[PDB]
Design a protein around this ligand. Sequence first.
Ligand SMILES: *[C@@H](CS(C)(=O)=O)[C@@H](NC(=O)c1cnc(C(C)(F)F)nc1Oc1ccccc1)C1CC1
Ligand SMILES: Nc1ncnc2c1ncn2[C@@H]1O[C@H](COP(=O)(O)OP(=O)(O)O)[C@@H](O)[C@H]1O
Ligand code: NA
Ligand SMILES: [Zn+2]
Length: 419
Amino acid sequence: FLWPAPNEEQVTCLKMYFGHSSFKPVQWKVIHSVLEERRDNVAVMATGYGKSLCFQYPPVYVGKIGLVISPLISLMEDQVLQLKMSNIPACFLGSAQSENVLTDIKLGKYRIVYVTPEYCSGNMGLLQQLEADIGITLIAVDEAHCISEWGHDFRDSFRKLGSLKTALPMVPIVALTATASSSIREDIVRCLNLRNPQITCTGFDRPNLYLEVRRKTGNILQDLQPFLVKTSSHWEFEGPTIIYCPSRKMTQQVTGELRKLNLSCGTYHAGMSFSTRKDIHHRFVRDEIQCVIATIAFGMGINKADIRQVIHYGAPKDMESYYQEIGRAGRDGLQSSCHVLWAPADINLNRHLLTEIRNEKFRLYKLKMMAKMEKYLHSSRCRRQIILSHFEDKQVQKASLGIMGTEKCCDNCRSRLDH
Ligand SMILES: *[C@@H](CS(C)(=O)=O)[C@@H](NC(=O)c1cnc(C(C)(F)F)nc1Oc1ccccc1)C1CC1
Ligand SMILES: Nc1ncnc2c1ncn2[C@@H]1O[C@H](COP(=O)(O)OP(=O)(O)O)[C@@H](O)[C@H]1O
Ligand code: NA
Ligand SMILES: [Zn+2]
């Protein structure tokens, strides 16, 4: 149940352009705030939990323009393709765009326009014309935590986006961050000059993720044996699989062992060229590769709808990273599994890489997130209950209540059902 209720036209539009029958409560909280109150928002949201509807839906519903600012060009191009397949006109606007498309943007032919921050600052006159002639429903600043010098993903062009509010005072900004850090949120608010923004978060309503934690020996094939099946003289996983490793070195070691089994896999980390990463990601989406072994940072992400298995090979960096990374599994809604294989000696459990972080408020935050991860690894409680417990106030959705306690929820619920 949603308050205030979406009207029938809003629901029909949701069905027709996004294929969803109802809004998630937090999606509606952002959407309604933008449409009715023209309110700035800081949306603490992760891919895989329903992030994109919050900024793609409003311009589609009113038939106007939504501007999405992001530094991740390849991801923006993929979104343009997906939107066009869902019959939503969208484009990437850059220096190379044809005048026919640029005039089409001015005529309001496109609902969603993706731009880089750097383009955005050099063409503010264009944005004001768009607002005057057509109306900008919202500006979404994706990867907004890149504004912060200490957030390990600093991109200085984001700090120029303070000009948006001055040029377009009546246009709400939705700043999307995948960290709940208060110091980063406060910097986002002040740098962008947001006004009394609404703060929201995705939660953990992902009932199709089975969660398991088990101890790791550190012998790679022994640890990976339960996930591997030999079929016709060939080793394979049961389905498309991501293995997240804490270090690039571990990613290469794991990949090396799997290649000796003639397994179809690819590595994915920030040391690789962009062109090679793009190829690996495309091959995984098209099922030419079965397993990606990744060390995720800097807004690298793996976007594939039918990821059946996620394996954290070693303790995750912290509780937010873990939440981000399991969220990438099972986006088609079918059953998926997320396993953590960990050991006390794991480097993310022996982090002096925090004892070196410069910013004091941020270091306290990361220490807190690491403590949460450690408590989770050691717990006998329902893993889903633990994750949800970190969203103190937040309502638990019915589907999550229904899965908890059953054999498909987590390893600890399964153990309870056995005895
Ligand atoms: C917003 C959610 S709420 C309960 O409505 O205030 C809030 N988020 C969190 O407190 C929060 C806590 N813990 C975790 C996690 C997964 F690390 F355990 N996530 C989390 O949140 C998010 C963090 C990253 C991405 C999405 C959500 C904000 C502080 C106000
Ligand atoms: N309003 C909704 N109703 C039902 N399921 C939803 C809704 N919004 C998102 N989802 C589901 O949540 C998951 C995450 O959304 P998805 O579109 O894959 O990515 P993103 O989080 O980047 O928007 C998917 O499984 C998707 O089907
Ligand atoms: Na659906
Ligand atoms: Zn459980």
